[PDB]
Design a protein around this motif. Structure first.
Motif, mmCIF file in Angstrom:
data_model
loop_
_atom_site.group_PDB
_atom_site.id
_atom_site.type_symbol
_atom_site.label_atom_id
_atom_site.label_comp_id
_atom_site.label_asym_id
_atom_site.label_seq_id
_atom_site.Cartn_x
_atom_site.Cartn_y
_atom_site.Cartn_z
ATOM 1 N N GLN A 22 -5.228 2.799 5.235
ATOM 2 C CA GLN A 22 -5.822 3.454 4.079
ATOM 3 C C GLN A 22 -4.790 3.867 3.039
ATOM 4 O O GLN A 22 -5.138 4.555 2.076
ATOM 5 N N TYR A 23 -3.535 3.463 3.208
ATOM 6 C CA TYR A 23 -2.461 3.797 2.283
ATOM 7 C C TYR A 23 -1.812 2.513 1.795
ATOM 8 O O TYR A 23 -1.528 1.616 2.594
ATOM 9 N N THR A 24 -1.592 2.423 0.490
ATOM 10 C CA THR A 24 -0.964 1.260 -0.115
ATOM 11 C C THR A 24 0.497 1.553 -0.424
ATOM 12 O O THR A 24 0.856 2.662 -0.824
ATOM 13 N N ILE A 25 1.339 0.544 -0.232
ATOM 14 C CA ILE A 25 2.757 0.673 -0.537
ATOM 15 C C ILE A 25 2.952 0.511 -2.036
ATOM 16 O O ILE A 25 2.324 -0.341 -2.672
ATOM 17 N N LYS A 26 3.827 1.333 -2.607
ATOM 18 C CA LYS A 26 4.141 1.295 -4.028
ATOM 19 C C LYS A 26 5.587 0.855 -4.187
ATOM 20 O O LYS A 26 6.500 1.538 -3.715
ATOM 21 N N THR A 74 8.226 8.375 -1.100
ATOM 22 C CA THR A 74 8.097 7.779 -2.427
ATOM 23 C C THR A 74 7.198 6.551 -2.389
ATOM 24 O O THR A 74 6.387 6.338 -3.297
ATOM 25 N N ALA A 75 7.335 5.728 -1.350
ATOM 26 C CA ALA A 75 6.534 4.512 -1.248
ATOM 27 C C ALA A 75 5.056 4.831 -1.062
ATOM 28 O O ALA A 75 4.194 4.190 -1.673
ATOM 29 N N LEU A 76 4.738 5.800 -0.203
ATOM 30 C CA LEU A 76 3.334 6.147 0.014
ATOM 31 C C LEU A 76 2.804 7.100 -1.053
ATOM 32 O O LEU A 76 1.663 6.956 -1.504
ATOM 33 N N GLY A 77 3.603 8.070 -1.464
ATOM 34 C CA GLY A 77 3.152 9.104 -2.380
ATOM 35 C C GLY A 77 3.183 10.453 -1.683
ATOM 36 O O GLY A 77 2.916 10.559 -0.481
ATOM 37 N N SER A 78 3.509 11.498 -2.446
ATOM 38 C CA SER A 78 3.711 12.820 -1.859
ATOM 39 C C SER A 78 2.416 13.390 -1.286
ATOM 40 O O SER A 78 2.398 13.908 -0.162
ATOM 41 N N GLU A 79 1.322 13.319 -2.049
ATOM 42 C CA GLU A 79 0.056 13.867 -1.569
ATOM 43 C C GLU A 79 -0.479 13.061 -0.391
ATOM 44 O O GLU A 79 -1.072 13.623 0.541
ATOM 45 N N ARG A 80 -0.264 11.744 -0.407
ATOM 46 C CA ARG A 80 -0.661 10.920 0.726
ATOM 47 C C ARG A 80 0.133 11.315 1.962
ATOM 48 O O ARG A 80 -0.385 11.266 3.082
ATOM 49 N N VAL A 81 1.390 11.729 1.772
ATOM 50 C CA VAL A 81 2.216 12.180 2.886
ATOM 51 C C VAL A 81 1.725 13.524 3.413
ATOM 52 O O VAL A 81 1.727 13.766 4.626
ATOM 53 N N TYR A 83 3.883 4.304 7.443
ATOM 54 C CA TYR A 83 4.661 3.423 6.576
ATOM 55 C C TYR A 83 4.641 1.989 7.080
ATOM 56 O O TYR A 83 4.485 1.048 6.298
ATOM 57 N N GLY A 84 4.822 1.799 8.383
ATOM 58 C CA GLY A 84 4.735 0.457 8.933
ATOM 59 C C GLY A 84 3.372 -0.171 8.718
ATOM 60 O O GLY A 84 3.264 -1.359 8.406
ATOM 61 N N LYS A 85 2.311 0.619 8.894
ATOM 62 C CA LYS A 85 0.954 0.124 8.688
ATOM 63 C C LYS A 85 0.708 -0.251 7.234
ATOM 64 O O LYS A 85 0.043 -1.251 6.947
ATOM 65 N N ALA A 86 1.203 0.561 6.300
ATOM 66 C CA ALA A 86 1.018 0.276 4.885
ATOM 67 C C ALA A 86 1.878 -0.884 4.419
ATOM 68 O O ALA A 86 1.502 -1.577 3.471
ATOM 69 N N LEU A 87 3.017 -1.108 5.065
ATOM 70 C CA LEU A 87 3.868 -2.238 4.725
ATOM 71 C C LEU A 87 3.301 -3.534 5.278
ATOM 72 O O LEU A 87 3.393 -4.579 4.630
ATOM 73 N N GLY A 88 2.708 -3.488 6.468
ATOM 74 C CA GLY A 88 2.107 -4.677 7.032
ATOM 75 C C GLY A 88 0.834 -5.118 6.352
ATOM 76 O O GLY A 88 0.399 -6.250 6.576
ATOM 77 N N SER A 89 0.225 -4.258 5.542
ATOM 78 C CA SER A 89 -1.004 -4.578 4.832
ATOM 79 C C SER A 89 -0.765 -5.042 3.404
ATOM 80 O O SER A 89 -1.715 -5.450 2.733
ATOM 81 N N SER A 90 0.472 -4.988 2.922
ATOM 82 C CA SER A 90 0.758 -5.423 1.566
ATOM 83 C C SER A 90 0.699 -6.940 1.470
ATOM 84 O O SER A 90 0.919 -7.658 2.448
ATOM 85 N N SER A 91 0.382 -7.425 0.270
ATOM 86 C CA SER A 91 0.251 -8.861 0.062
ATOM 87 C C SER A 91 1.609 -9.548 0.053
ATOM 88 O O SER A 91 1.780 -10.602 0.674
ATOM 89 N N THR A 92 2.586 -8.965 -0.629
ATOM 90 C CA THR A 92 3.920 -9.535 -0.731
ATOM 91 C C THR A 92 4.947 -8.532 -0.213
ATOM 92 O O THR A 92 4.608 -7.447 0.257
ATOM 93 N N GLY A 93 6.212 -8.907 -0.315
ATOM 94 C CA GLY A 93 7.293 -8.040 0.099
ATOM 95 C C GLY A 93 8.588 -8.817 0.139
ATOM 96 O O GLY A 93 8.619 -10.031 -0.072
ATOM 97 N N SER A 94 9.659 -8.093 0.424
ATOM 98 C CA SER A 94 10.986 -8.680 0.484
ATOM 99 C C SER A 94 11.301 -9.099 1.911
ATOM 100 O O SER A 94 10.535 -8.853 2.843
ATOM 101 N N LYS A 95 12.438 -9.774 2.071
ATOM 102 C CA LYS A 95 12.869 -10.167 3.407
ATOM 103 C C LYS A 95 13.194 -8.945 4.254
ATOM 104 O O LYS A 95 12.938 -8.932 5.464
#
Lengths: 7, 363, 50, 99, 49
Positions: C22-26, B72-79, B225-237
Motif C-alpha cells: 500500500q506504499y509507493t516508492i518515490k 524519504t522514499a516512502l514519505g514521513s507520514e507514511r512512516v 521498504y522492501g515491499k514498496a520497492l518490489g512493487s515498483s515498475s522500474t528501478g536501478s540495478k
RNA sequence: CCCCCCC
RNA sequence: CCCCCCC
RNA sequence: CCCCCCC
C-alpha cells in the motif's frame, strides 16, 4: 577551499 | 470401537487464541524517533554517499541514515503510519535543515546541514568534514566520474544493501551475521566496492545490527521498504540487488520447515520409520498453520513477532532428527547449530542421503 | 503416516508480499526531463534525419 | 540481573493467581494481545512461548490419549477399552465443540 | 521490440525447449527432486501474466 | 544477488 | 469432585 | 522457550 567542492 | 474421535488440534487452537484478540499491546509510549521528509531526499542521498567514500572514525548512526533514506522514499507520514501499525506508540521527530554558520557553499548561500533527532550534530558534521577532506585529497592527487561521487543516486541503496545483508541474518548471532555480511558483500556489492574502495563494511553492518536490535519497529519499516520497492515498475540495478537480498531474507528463522520439505522431496526412506510416522500429524499441523498464516508467515521471525514459535518444529524430535540427517547427507546442513535429539535416526538418514546423492538414477 | 502436508509455497508468498503493498516508492524527486509536443513532430523528424 | 530472587517472585505470582482469579483472565488477555502484535522484543517472544506452553494445562490426559492412539497401542483393542471408547470420543467431540 | 520481449529470462525458454526436446536426463533423480520449485517458477510467470 | 546465445 | 510429567 | 547453513 574545503567547503567549496562540487560534491 | 474405532479410534477416530481421538483428535486434538492444539496448534490451530493456539493460533486462534493468539490472532483473535480485541486488545492491542501498547509499547514505547514515551519514546521518539526521527524521519526525513521526501523533499530532503537529495540532501540525504549525498550524506548517504559521504559514509561510503571516506574512512570514518565512528559509524554509530550509518543505519539511522539508511532508515532516513527509507523515510524519504516512502514519505514521513507514511512512516508514521507504518510505525503505528507495527504496534509501537513511538512519536516521529521531523528532520530539519540548519545553517552551519559563517561557512559558505559554492552556490553562495549558507551551508545547510541535516538535523536528525537522536543523531548528534557532531557526528554528522564530522562525517561531512572527513568526506570533504578525502575528496580534496583525491582531487589534489589526481584530476572523478559521477558514479564515484557521494551524490550518486544509488549510494543510499548501497548502504541499505549492507543493511539488507545484515537483515538476512537477524535470526542468527551477531558475530555470524557480521561474518556473513562481510563475506557476501565482498561479492554482492563488488561493483560498489570498486566505485567506493574505502567503505568500511564491518562497522556499517554493526551499526545496522544495533539499529535492528534497539528499534524493533525499524524492522517493520525495512520490510515495508522492501515491499514498496518490489512493487515498483522500474528501478536501478542497486534496487534490484536490494530486493534480491531482501527476498533472500524471507524465510529466516524457519529453515527447519524448508529442510523438512527438502527431506520429503529427497524421498528419505527413514521418514517411514515408526518413530517418525508417530509424529507426522503434528508436522502436517505446523505446515497447515503456515498455510493459514499465509505470505506474512515467512516474515514472522524477521519482524520478531511474538507469534513466531507456533511455527517451531521443536516438539517433533524424530522428524527433526531425520530432517537434519537428510540435510547432512546432502551436505546442505553446513554449520547449522540446530540440536539433534536422536543420533541413530540422524546417522541413518545421513547414510541414506549420501547413498542417494552419490548414486544416480533415471525415472 | 503420509507426507502430503509437507508443502511450503515460498515463491508464491514472496510474490504476494511484493505485489500487495500500500506504499509507493518515490524516486527522482528533484530531477527533470524533456519532452516534445506533437505539434513539433515535423521539426523533430527532420532533425531525426539530420 | 544476577541477584533477582526467582523463588520469592514465583511465590508472589502464585499467591496473586490464587487470591485474585480474575487476574488469571487478565494474564491470558495479555498473552493474547502480545501474540497478536506485529513486532516485539526477545523477552516478549519468550513470554508468548511460555504462555503457549501453559495452554493445555489441566488436560494432559487428553494429550496422552492422542499420543497413545498415535502410538498404535494394541491394548487399545482390549474389549474393556472398546466398551468405553464411545464416551472418550464424546469427550473429544466436546473439546471440538468448545473450540 | 517483440524480439526484446523475454529478455533476461532465457533460462525459462530453454527449459521449455528441453521439455519439448524430451531430454531423458530430466528423469534423473536429482532433477526430479527439484521440479516442484521449477513448476512454481512457471506458475509465477503465469500469475504475473 | 540476478543477468548473459541467436534471430 | 477435578487436577497432577517434561519443554 | 525459540532461533542458528549457504546463496
Amino acid at each position: 577551499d574545503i567547503y567549496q567542492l562540487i560534491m | 470401537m474405532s479410534l477416530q474421535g481421538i483428535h486434538l488440534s492444539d496448534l490451530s487452537y493456539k493460533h486462534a487464541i493468539l490472532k483473535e484478540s480485541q486488545y492491542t499491546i501498547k509499547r514505547d509510549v514515551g519514546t521518539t524517533t526521527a524521519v526525513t521528509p521526501s523533499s530532503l531526499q537529495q540532501e540525504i542521498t549525498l550524506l548517504c554517499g559521504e559514509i561510503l567514500y571516506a574512512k570514518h572514525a565512528d559509524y554509530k548512526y550509518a543505519a539511522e541514515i539508511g532508515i532516513q533514506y527509507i523515510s524519504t522514499a516512502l514519505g514521513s507520514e507514511r512512516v508514521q503510519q507504518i510505525l503505528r501499525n507495527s504496534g509501537s506508540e513511538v512519536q516521529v521527530v521531523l528532520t530539519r535543515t540548519y545553517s552551519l554558520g559563517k561557512i559558505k557553499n559554492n552556490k553562495g548561500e549558507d551551508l545547510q546541514m541535516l538535523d536528525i533527532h537522536g543523531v548528534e550534530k557532531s557526528w554528522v558534521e564530522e562525517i561531512d568534514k572527513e568526506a570533504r577532506k578525502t575528496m580534496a585529497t583525491l582531487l589534489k592527487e589526481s584530476s572523478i566520474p559521477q558514479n564515484q561521487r557521494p551524490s550518486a543516486p544509488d549510494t543510499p541503496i548501497i548502504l541499505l544493501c549492507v543493511g539488507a545483508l545484515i537483515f538476512t541474518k537477524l535470526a542468527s548471532t551477531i558475530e555470524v551475521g557480521l561474518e556473513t555480511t562481510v563475506r557476501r558483500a565482498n561479492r554482492v556489492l563488488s561493483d560498489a566496492l570498486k566505485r567506493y574502495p574505502r567503505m568500511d563494511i564491518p562497522k556499517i553492518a554493526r551499526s545496522f545490527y544495533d539499529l535492528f536490535e534497539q528499534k524493533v519497529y525499524h524492522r517493520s519499516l525495512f520490510i515495508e521498504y522492501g515491499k514498496a520497492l518490489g512493487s515498483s515498475s522500474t528501478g536501478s540495478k542497486a534496487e534490484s540487488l536490494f530486493v534480491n537480498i531482501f527476498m533472500q531474507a524471507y524465510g529466516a528463522g524457519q529453515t527447519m520447515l524448508r529442510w523438512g520439505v527438502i527431506a520429503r522431496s529427497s524421498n528419505n526412506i527413514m521418514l517411514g520409520h515408526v518413530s517418525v510416522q508417530a509424529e507426522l500429524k503434528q508436522v502436517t499441523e505446523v505446515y497447515d498453520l503456515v498455510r493459514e498464516m499465509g505470505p506474512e508467515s515467512g516474515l514472522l521471525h524477521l519482524r520478531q513477532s511474538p507469534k513466531a514459535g507456533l511455527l517451531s518444529l521443536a516438539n517433533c524430535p524424530n522428524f527433526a532428527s531425520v530432517v537434519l540427517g537428510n540435510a547432512s547427507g546432502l551436505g546442505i546442513i553446513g554449520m547449522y547449530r540446530g540440536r539433534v535429539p536422536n543420533t541413530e535416526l540422524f546417522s541413518a538418514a545421513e547414510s541414506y542421503a549420501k547413498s542417494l546423492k552419490e548414486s544416480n538414477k533415471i525415472n
